[PDB]
Design a protein around this ligand. Structure first.
Ligand code: PRO
Ligand code: PRO
Ligand SMILES: [Cl-]
Ligand SMILES: [Mn+2]
Ligand SMILES: [Mn+2]
Ligand SMILES: [Mn+2]
Ligand SMILES: [Mn+2]
Ligand code: NA
Ligand code: NA
Ligand SMILES: [O-]
Ligand SMILES: [O-]
Lengths: 478, 480
């Protein structure tokens, strides 16, 4: 069948990928006792937007659930799926003649049917008439809460929908659950996004020089990715140098990658391109001047140790919060070896000291969204403890899940000062040694992995050992 | 005073630029007989957004009026200006402690006061109390219609605003009129955006090779611009090759710069970086293989002729629609000299034949928005004729306006076929020559210019003659 392709060496993505997702969704819905015979899933695609009140167009990126189900890149569409038969219908805008002048060819409905390999295509203005003819029992629409943003998903609406029976509770948990488990076709796309993003990270490590602005490396990364067919990034590039490497989502408008990289700084670059709305998320940490100091090597190798320990322990049935605590324990052991900490590591763990150094979650589901859906389905509770409460899932691992593994150690003044004021934590901290690390920034090492039947598959391929990184930055051939 | 600067060779932009805009707005409002003593301008800044229901953040770019007045890059702010005194107060978010971990330093109010050179800084949740204490007569808020999008500007609102008298009609036309006329400080920024975008266009012409995808050149352009501190483009890059060069806003999600460039194609690349929310908009047209054919040279030089004629005629007092008609006439003359058209050019103009080949407006105001505000203030009407109806302004030129000059000639099948079906237009077209230009695409030559006291200043600096373009594509130093 047809494939999405941007030519050159970009990945050909079969539209069969989305057909399989529709089939999988129907199979889940058919097993749901609340689902009535003759139900139709109704999804509404994203629409074109502009900046504020201006006519400045924003490049359109499809809504993630709609993309998962249909792979459609055009704005203004709807898509429906008959649950009992799996039959798919795409609804496309009926365009005015002037579109031909300003926007491009006015494709026929048959063109879209062949392009997307759906069973039928109709115009958007006919959706009520078409659905009416199908005599559905109920329309299943999308409404639920995203557990990372707290936002409510926007349910489909069209002129005349009030004449139908509509259910907006059944679908969301079911389609979320399908998205949690990646098909082999989806994994192929995630291997490509990781390949290109990994290559771009390597080019960035080779290019970094003292005196550059952080945004120069954002620029280079996005150039490499967009040359590889990625018009979008998965999230705003985080290019933190020096003390900014301790700022977890650095790079947003309020802190816009505008610092000059100085000799002796650590760099923490968290960047990932997006291909056909599939994410990647990779973090590389390294010295700006290409040579780890003793202190930098010690912190860096501590995070390398926890990274490797977590990846090695991951397999079906492992509880993700246990991986987070494993990383905590390793960091505390290493910080104790360094002399930053003293005492019983068991006692440090009881006092939640790990969270002073890693305040974020160990890692998260990744897919069509970088912080992918389904981390906290009904029955899965957030753990109300430092560090763990920031975990984006408390689930047990199963084959087909895709996770980031991103331990880090940071020296964050307000967390350190808090710990130093607390007699339950202060006795573990050696102020005279810690002082040397004030302003160090931080290290994060982030890999993307897939859970397999017996372990994991690593998607990411960047230099990771101190020797590998220094060789890469020194411009060595291999 | 303080400046916005992204280091290296980027432009230092004094925050005095925005103080001058606030002063100009106050001066204009003080002269407005309907403005009450003790009025305060109240603007609401943009807020950060995410993709749909996800937590995927969208890089925040400030709302344009708020930017014009304050230059503030942070989301979630408000800004007020006392009309009678000119005193400015910025309201910033009161951030949670966790911001320090995830987002960065929690800057003090004094930090923002020094950064933006405003008179006072307060937290946003205190806006009702602060304004109550100042005892304003009226709050002047922003509401009006953008004449390019048809959208209504978002009026400021805050909890407790219902306790104040609010006027939402006075401000919009006045602040729009201030934006229409660029200060010398604003022109410095527009010169920088044009410099970097021009250089990026030159790099693209030097790099293009037959066999590339259009999006590879979009990628190169944005790389050059972002290396120069332009994190955003002014609009989505239009990289049309072959027949796609006849599609005016090609490059959007539905037609995403995904064609392979072929030998013999013309390229039409309309791209412009944005620096600190100031736009650029430049179009370069050239042969993909670096050598104009005779047919390509003829079409290209027709548009070069109208470009230069319009630039030569522009000065204060000139009616912009007259410039559009001048370009139409030149295109028709040259298409006749090429043998594509025959008969009386005067008759062709009466039949609106120019619009078949240039269906869009000659050019538009440019500023903080690429299609800048104020093209159609009250009393200025849109002309209901082919081509002219797409003009984004029907104003007379005055010093300080910034305009694009962007004539083009395209071979658009449904427009050509309409003309051939119309007895009033069909006889002018010579099908035996025209057939050769089906699928040609088109040529557009777009310069950014400033209206001066007596003429124009050209901002754009790219190769324009056939000889200059072929030299650029052959890798010649720009000085040559
Ligand atoms: O937001 C998160 O979960 C991870 C933590 C480090 C940056 N991204
Ligand atoms: O929208 C406009 O007015 C111009 C016409 C060509 C592309 N941009
Ligand atoms: Cl013809
Ligand atoms: Mn990351
Ligand atoms: Mn991540
Ligand atoms: Mn343009
Ligand atoms: Mn333009
Ligand atoms: Na293992
Ligand atoms: Na070239
Ligand atoms: O991350
Ligand atoms: O343009």
């Amino acid at each position: 069948g047809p494939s999405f392709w941007l030519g050159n060496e970009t990945l050909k993505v079969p539209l069969a990928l989305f057909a399989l997702n529709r089939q999988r969704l129907c199979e889940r819905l058919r097993k749901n006792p609340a689902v009535q015979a003759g139900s139709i899933v109704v999804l509404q695609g994203g629409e074109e937007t502009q900046r504020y009140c201006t006519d400045t167009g924003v490049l359109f990126r499809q809504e993630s659930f709609f993309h998962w189900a249909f792979g459609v890149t055009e704005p203004g569409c709807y898509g429906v799926i008959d649950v009992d038969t799996g039959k798919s219908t795409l609804f496309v805008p009926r365009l005015p003649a002037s579109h031909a002048t300003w926007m491009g060819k006015i494709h026929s409905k048959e063109h879209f049917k062949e392009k997307y390999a759906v069973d039928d295509v109709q115009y958007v203005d006919e959706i009520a008439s078409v659905l009416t003819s199908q005599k559905p029992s109920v329309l299943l629409t999308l409404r639920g809460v995203n557990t990372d943003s707290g936002s409510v998903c926007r349910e489909a609406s069209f002129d005349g929908i009030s004449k139908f029976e509509v259910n907006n509770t059944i679908l969301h948990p079911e389609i979320v659950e399908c998205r949690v488990f990646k098909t082999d076709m989806e994994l192929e796309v995630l291997r490509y996004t990781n390949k290109i993003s990994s290559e771009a990270h390597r080019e960035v490590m080779k290019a970094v020089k003292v005196g550059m602005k952080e945004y120069e490396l954002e620029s280079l990364f996005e150039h490499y990715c967009s040359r590889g067919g990625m018009r979008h990034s998965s999230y705003t590039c985080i290019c933190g140098s020096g003390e900014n490497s301790a700022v977890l989502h650095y790079g947003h408008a309020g802190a816009p990658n505008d610092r000059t990289i100085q000799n002796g700084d650590m760099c923490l670059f968290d960047m990932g391109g997006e291909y056909y709305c599939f994410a990647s998320d990779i973090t590389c940490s390294f010295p700006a001047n290409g040579k780890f100091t003793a202190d930098q090597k010690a912190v860096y190798e501590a995070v390398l140790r926890s990274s490797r320990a977590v990846m090695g322990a991951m397999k079906p049935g492992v509880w993700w919060p246990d991986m987070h605590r494993l990383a905590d324990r390793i960091h505390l052991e290493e910080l104790a070896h360094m002399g930053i900490l003293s005492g019983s590591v068991d006692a440090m763990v009881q006092a939640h000291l790990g969270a002073v150094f890693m305040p974020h979650g160990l890692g998260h589901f990744l897919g069509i969204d970088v912080h992918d859906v389904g981390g906290y389905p009904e029955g899965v509770e957030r753990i109300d403890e430092p560090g763990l409460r920031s975990l984006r899932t408390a689930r047990h691992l199963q084959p087909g899940m895709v996770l980031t593994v991103e331990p880090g150690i940071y020296f964050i003044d307000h967390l350190l000062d808090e710990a130093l004021a607390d007699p339950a934590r202060a006795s573990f901290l050696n102020r005279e040694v810690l002082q040397r690390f004030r302003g160090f920034g931080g290290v994060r090492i982030e890999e993307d992995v897939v859970v397999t039947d017996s372990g994991i598959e690593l998607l990411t391929c960047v230099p990771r050992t101190v020797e590998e990184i220094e060789a890469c930055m020194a411009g060595c051939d291999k």
